[PDB]
Design a binder for this molecule. Structure first.
Ligand SMILES: Cc1ccc2oc(C#Cc3ccc(C(=O)NCCOCCOCCNC(=O)c4ccc(C#Cc5oc6ccc(C)cc6c5CC(=O)O)cc4)cc3)c(CC(=O)O)c2c1
Lengths: 143, 141
C-alpha cells in the first residue's frame, strides 16, 4: 500500500528527532526539531511522496492546529494506532557510527538516513528501501 | 539523466531559496537557505541524495565551488559537481508561491506548497510520476 506511513519521535543530545517510515518499503525520512514543525515535515513529505495515511501512537498530533491544517491542505488522513521501533534503534546505532564525522547532530541523522535507505535491505543483493519505495510507487501508478 | 540534477538559487521576500531540479523529469526539491553557500547547502544535498539517486549536480556559476563543506558532502555521498547547466523552473515556482502565499504564515511553507503543486499537477504525467517512472525503469535495467 503505497501511501501508508508511520510517524514517531525520538531523542538524542536533548533534541527530538521526527521519524517517518514508509511501512511497505522500510524507506524513512527524519529530521531534528513543535506542531508547526511536524506540519512542515508532513507537508514536505507529502509533496515528495504519496502520503495518504499517517499512523501515530499517541494523542499529541490530534491536538495540533497546524498538523490538522497541513493534513487538510495535503489530503492526509491521520489515524491512531501504528500499524519501526526497531527502526528508531537501528537509526541510533548508525548515528553512533557517524556521529564523530559531523559537527551537527542533524547532519549525523541525515548520514544515518542515507545509509538506511541506500544499503541493501537484505545485506546483499535485492533492493534498498530507497529502491523499493519507488518500485512500489511505480507499480501503483501503473495500475 | 537518471541521477543528473540541476542546482540553483532564486530569491523571494528577502530570502534565498535553493532549488534542485531532476532534469529528465522536472521534479524539484526546494528549501530556504543562507546567502552563504556552505554548511546548509551541503546539508540540503546530503538530504536530497538520501532520498533519490544523486550522482551529478550541475551549476552554472561559481558559488557552489567555494565551500569546503559542500565538497565534503559531495565526497561523502558520491556526488559529482559539474559546471554548466545548459530550466526556468524558478519562474513557475514563484508563480505558484504567489498563488498560495496567503494560505500560510511562513514563506518556507508557501515554497513547500508550491513544490507539492509543481510536482503533483500534470494530461500525461506529473514531474512526480515521471521521476518515479524514470528511476523504476532504470532499476529494472
Ligand atoms: C560531510 C557533511 C555533509 C553534509 C553536511 O551538512 C552539514 C550542515 C549543516 C547545518 C544545517 C542546518 C543548520 C541550521 O539549521 N542553522 C540555523 C537554523 O536554525 C533554526 C532551526 O530551526 C528551524 C525552525 N525555525 C522556523 O522558523 C520554522 C518556522 C515555521 C515552520 C512551519 C510551519 C508550517 O507548516 C505548515 C504546513 C501546512 C500548513 C497548512 C501550515 C504550516 C505551517 C505554519 C505556516 O507557515 O502557516 C517551521 C520552522 C546549521 C548547519 C555539515 C556540517 C557539519 O555538521 O559537520 C555537513 C558535512
Amino acid at each position: 500500500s503505497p501511501g501508508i506511513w508511520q510517524l514517531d519521535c525520538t531523542h538524542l543530545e536533548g533534541k527530538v528527532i521526527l521519524v517517518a517510515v514508509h511501512v511497505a518499503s522500510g524507506y524513512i525520512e527524519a529530521e531534528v526539531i513543535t506542531g508547526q514543525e511536524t506540519a512542515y515535515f508532513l507537508l514536505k513529505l507529502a509533496g515528495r511522496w504519496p502520503v495518504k495515511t499517517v499512523h501515530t501512537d499517541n494523542g499529541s498530533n490530534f491536538t495540533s492546529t497546524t498538523v490538522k491544517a497541513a493534513c487538510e491542505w495535503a489530503g492526509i488522513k491521520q489515524e491512531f494506532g501504528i500499524p519501526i521501533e526497531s527502526m528508531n534503534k537501528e537509526l541510533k546505532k548508525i548515528i553512533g557510527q557517524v556521529r564523530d564525522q559531523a559537527e551537527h547532530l542533524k547532519t549525523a541523522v541525515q548520514m544515518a538516513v542515507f545509509i538506511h535507505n541506500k544499503k541493501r535491505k537484505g545485506g546483499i543483493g535485492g533492493y534498498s528501501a530507497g529502491e523499493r519505495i519507488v518500485d512500489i510507487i511505480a507499480t501503483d501508478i501503473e495500475t
